[PDB]
Structures are given as structure tokens and as C-alpha cells.
């Protein structure tokens, strides 16, 4: 087993910036090492093989370097579409060993989210479950605290989130928070709110609705 040490595990850099990722192997693998880009939801796609050869069609932004036990992948000028996890792979012997990946995020100026709120639908209630959706839209950075409050008591353990990928043209995220109850308990309270804290907001923005109005 040829062990592979990829570094950094994760990084944030700006559009236009030089990024440089490093792989290290525990044996001399000569020049048999490849680098892959993996976009969100997609299969890995070859960027560089035998250490320094560019796959036909890959931007020239990407270069490959080194040999023996030390290899470096460089992105000359990072572009918004370069959000990916990058992975080296040793191609010298089996078993095949990959590095553990480098997550790369593009960094851009702060953009406060827009908070939308969506009450449960009649059809869903007709069925005895109530689900409230909170939607923060186009923000950066990724970090956001989103809290649910029903009748102003804070909720804990009855909701969950999902974040999308960094958008590949304007480098922002959107997030959904979904609090979920039974008709039973939904009917006991009037006001539902989500409360959002984010660096682009000088103050927590709460968006709410009173039940059925």
C-alpha cells in the first residue's frame, strides 16, 4: 500500500489567486501520479497524469509538478468554476490509493442571504404532519446560524438543514432549514419564525408567520 498524503485538506482562496495542492507518497512512485477534479454531484474528471501532463481540454490554469515522492498540483488563477474536491491518485501499483482530497472554496466579498419562509401546505396537513421551510438565498460565507422559534421558544432537535454547492458563476450558497411537526403540535402555537445570523447582517433577521393568515 502506497500511502498518499494530500494537503491541505481544505482551503479558501480568491478568484485569480494561485492555489497549490500537495501530495506525498510513501514510496518512490517515480512519475506515476495523476490529479482529478471532482465537482459536486459528478464523477471525478482527469486533470493531470504522469505528474505534469495536461489532459487535452483542461484549462491551462492547471499544472502538475514533481516526481519520486513529492508532487504538487497548481492552479495558476483560480476561477469560480473551480469549486471542487481535488484528489491525487498513485498509478504505480495496486491497491490503488488516492489522497484524502482537498476541498477548495472560492472566497468573495460578504453577501447577506435573503430569508424566505414557507408555511406548510393544506395537503400536507390534510395528512397530519406539518413542515416549515426557511430559505436563505445567495450568501457568502457559508457559515450561518439558522434558528427556529415557535411562539418565541427556541427549537432544538426537530429540524434540519441542507446547503447547496458554491454557485459556479457568482460563488454564493443557498440553504434550507426545515422544521417539522405533527398537526397535533402545530395547532397549539401561533407564530413560526426562523432566525438568521450571518456576517453580512448587522443584526439577526427574523422572518415569521402567524398560523393560517
Amino acid at each position: 500500500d502506497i500511502q498518499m498524503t494530500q494537503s491541505p485538506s481544505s482551503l479558501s482562496a480568491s478568484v485569480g489567486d494561485r492555489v497549490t495542492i500537495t501530495c506525498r507518497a510513501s514510496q518512490d512512485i517515480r512519475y506515476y501520479l495523476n490529479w482529478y477534479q471532482q465537482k459536486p454531484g459528478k464523477a471525478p474528471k482527469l486533470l493531470i497524469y504522469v505528474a505534469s501532463s495536461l489532459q487535452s481540454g483542461v484549462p491551462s490554469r492547471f499544472s502538475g509538478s514533481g516526481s519520486g515522492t513529492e508532487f504538487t498540483l497548481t492552479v495558476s488563477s483560480l476561477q469560480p468554476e473551480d469549486f471542487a474536491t481535488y484528489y491525487c491518485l498513485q498509478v504505480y501499483s495496486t491497491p490503488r490509493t488516492f489522497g484524502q482530497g482537498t476541498k477548495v472554496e472560492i472566497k468573495r466579498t460578504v453577501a447577506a442571504p435573503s430569508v424566505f419562509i414557507f408555511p406548510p401546505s393544506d395537503e400536507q396537513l390534510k395528512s397530519g404532519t406539518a413542515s416549515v421551510v426557511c430559505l436563505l438565498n445567495n450568501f457568502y460565507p457559508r457559515e450561518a446560524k439558522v434558528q427556529w422559534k415557535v411562539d418565541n421558544a427556541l427549537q432544538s432537535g426537530n429540524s434540519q438543514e441542507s446547503v447547496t454547492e458554491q454557485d459556479s458563476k457568482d460563488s454564493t450558497y443557498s440553504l434550507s432549514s426545515t422544521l417539522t411537526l405533527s398537526k397535533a403540535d402545530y395547532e397549539k402555537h401561533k407564530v413560526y419564525a426562523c432566525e438568521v445570523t450571518h456576517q453580512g447582517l448587522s443584526s439577526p433577521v427574523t422572518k415569521s408567520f402567524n398560523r393560517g393568515e
Partner: protein, 217 residues
């Protein structure tokens, strides 16, 4: 470009078996000249090599992870690669890539999801997220695609006509053991007139399709 299209596999109870297939096309020389591989990726994690096969069919390499239970094969007459997966186990839950790793002919299939679980298939309920104070100069509306198993579902809006402003969220696993996601689109406020917004949910594992018109509040 080598092109690799996977088939199989789906949902399977622990102890059971599935088979993956993969069709290959596009190699400069003929299929039988190329060693071939499966790689996998579990939810949350990175890539893990699974198995390799030589040109003829012999020899074969396996990861300790799967030795004993999985078997790789090949039918050169048909440009097809297989992975018989026996004795399935929770840990085996991953997306499986057919991969061509021969230098100068690198290609990965799109992947096919395998879920090892005792939960059974279940079609989603699709409730609308109604445009409302989902609003300024802009309106947001969506679909709550809720309680289904296994992954995936696909969501389209007005049958692919409307891709502008659409964000389909990654699925989350609920404490019930079932999944849920939302899909949403921001559209011009004033257009909610007037303009119909139907989302299309599709769950191949339940052989389900729902289409649903979202509408104002």
C-alpha cells in the same frame, strides 16, 4: 473520449447481492486491450478503489475491503465490465464508478448508487412550497419532496423549460430513516399572475412520477 455507462444496481438488503454493469465505447484500440477498474465513494467520503481486471479477464485485483464477496468480470465480445456484489453489507453503500485508468485513456462513468439496507422502497409525497411572503420584486416558490427511499429523486420544473434560478437541495436523511429535500425557484414577482409553475418529481425506485402545480397565497 472513452465513454463508460453504468447499469445496475440499486437497493439491496444486507446479505443480498447485486450486479453492476458498464458499457464501454471509444477506446482507440479494442476493448480487450485495456485493464479496467471499479472505484467507489460513500456518502460523506472520498474515493476508494474497489477492484481491477486485466485485459483478458485474468488476473484480478481486489481491495481487502471487498475481497471474498465481490467479483469482477468482463465480456470482451460485448465491451462490458461487471461487478457481482455478494454478501452485501451497510458499509458497501456507495456510488460506484466504472473507471478506465490506463494512462492516455482515462474515463469515469457517471456512477450508480448502491444502497445496502433493510428499509424498503418508498415513493415520496410532494407538497408545494407556496409563493407568498416568499418574496421583493422577487418571489420564491418550490416543492417539498418528502419521505422517500432510497435515493435519488429528480426534480424538474415545467419539464426542463425553467432552469433559471433553480436550486435543488441535497437530500437529508430524517430520523425516521427516510429522506427528504426541497426544490426551489426564484421567478419574477409580477409573473405569478398568469404563469403556471409545475414541478415534476421522479422516483425510479418506486416507479413514481408526480407533477405538481405550485400556487400563490
Amino acid at each position: 473520449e472513452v465513454q463508460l455507462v453504468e447499469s445496475g444496481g440499486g437497493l439491496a438488503k444486507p446479505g443480498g447481492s447485486l450486479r453492476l454493469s458498464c458499457a464501454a465505447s471509444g477506446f482507440r484500440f479494442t476493448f480487450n486491450n485495456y485493464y479496467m477498474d471499479w472505484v467507489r465513494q460513500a456518502p460523506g467520503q472520498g474515493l476508494e478503489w474497489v477492484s481491477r481486471i486485466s485485459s483478458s479477464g485474468d488476473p484480478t485485483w481486489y481491495a481487502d475491503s471487498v475481497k471474498g464477496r465481490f467479483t469482477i468480470s468482463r465480456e470482451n465480445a460485448k465491451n462490458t465490465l461487471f461487478l457481482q456484489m455478494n454478501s452485501l453489507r451497510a458499509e458497501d453503500t456507495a456510488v460506484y464508478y466504472c473507471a478506465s485508468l490506463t494512462t492516455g485513456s482515462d474515463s469515469w462513468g457517471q456512477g450508480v448508487l448502491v444502497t445496502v439496507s433493510s428499509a424498503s422502497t418508498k415513493g415520496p409525497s410532494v407538497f408545494p412550497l407556496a409563493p407568498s411572503s416568499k418574496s421583493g420584486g422577487t418571489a420564491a416558490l418550490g416543492c417539498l419532496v418528502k419521505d422517500y427511499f432510497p435515493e435519488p429523486v429528480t426534480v424538474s420544473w415545467n419539464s426542463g423549460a425553467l432552469t433559471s434560478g433553480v436550486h435543488t437541495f441535497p437530500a437529508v436523511l430524517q430520523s425516521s430513516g427516510l429522506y427528504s429535500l426541497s426544490s426551489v425557484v426564484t421567478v419574477p414577482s409580477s409573473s405569478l399572475g398568469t404563469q403556471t409553475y409545475i414541478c415534476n418529481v421522479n422516483h425510479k425506485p418506486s416507479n413514481t412520477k408526480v407533477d405538481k402545480k405550485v400556487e400563490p397565497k
